[PDB]
Amino acid sequence: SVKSEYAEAAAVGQEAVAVFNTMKAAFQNGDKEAVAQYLARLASLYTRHEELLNRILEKARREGNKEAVTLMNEFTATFQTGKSIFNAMVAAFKNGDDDSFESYLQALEKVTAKGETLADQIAKAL
Ligand SMILES: O=C(O)c1cc2ccccc2o1
C-alpha cells in the first residue's frame, strides 16, 4: 500500500539521518576521506528518498487523497530546500570552505528538524 511505501521511504530518510550524523563527527574530527565517502552515500540516499516520495505523491494524487496530496506537496517542497542546502554543502567541501560547510550543515539540521511534524502527519494521512 501507499502507507507501507511511505514507511519504507521513512526508513531511507532515517538512514540518511544516521549517515549525516556520522559525517558531522568526521568533519569535526578533520577526517576528510571519511567525509567524502559519507557525502557520496548521502547523495545516493537522498536521490532514493526523493524518488520514493514522488511515487507516493503521484499515487496519492491518483487515489484522490486530497489531504495527503496537500501535505505531500508541502513536504516535497521542504525536501527540495534540504536538497539545495545539501548540494551547497557538497560544493563547500569540494572548495575547501569549512566556514560555508559548517553554515550549510547547521541549516540542513534545522530544515530537517522543522519538517518532522509534517513527516509524521503524512504517515497518518495516507
Ligand atoms: O529525509 C532525508 O532524506 C534526509 C534528512 C536529512 C538530514 C540531514 C542530511 C540529509 C538528510 O536527508
Side-chain angles (χ1 to χ4, degrees):
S1 73
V2 70
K3 195 176 297 185
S4 65
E5 280 143 19
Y6 187 74
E8 298 149 18
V12 173
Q14 287 312 108
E15 197 179 325
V17 169
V19 174
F20 180 94
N21 284 319
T22 303
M23 176 276 298
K24 175 185 188 174
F27 167 74
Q28 296 175 349
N29 289 332
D31 185 352
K32 299 179 66 175
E33 295 192 29
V35 172
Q37 285 169 268
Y38 294 133
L39 292 174
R41 191 64 162 190
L42 285 163
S44 182
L45 285 165
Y46 294 140
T47 291
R48 173 70 169 160
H49 198 186
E50 186 174 348
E51 207 271 315
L52 299 179
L53 289 166
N54 286 338
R55 285 162 28 180
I56 288 159
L57 170 55
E58 291 153 6
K59 188 156 179 175
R61 287 173 177 153
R62 289 194 303 273
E63 291 177 348
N65 186 338
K66 288 192 180 67
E67 184 55 33
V69 171
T70 298
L71 300 172
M72 281 292 300
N73 284 325
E74 296 174 324
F75 190 73
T76 53
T78 306
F79 181 93
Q80 290 295 320
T81 304
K83 182 187 175 174
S84 297
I85 292 164
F86 175 73
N87 286 338
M89 192 177 61
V90 171
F93 179 73
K94 177 179 183 196
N95 284 324
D97 181 355
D98 286 349
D99 167 84
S100 296
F101 192 92
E102 296 147 13
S103 177
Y104 292 130
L105 193 151
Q106 285 199 37
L108 186 50
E109 283 176 334
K110 290 172 192 170
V111 157
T112 299
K114 285 188 175 67
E116 285 330 298
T117 59
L118 177 57
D120 282 1
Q121 285 175 239
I122 292 162
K124 297 165 184 171
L126 288 167

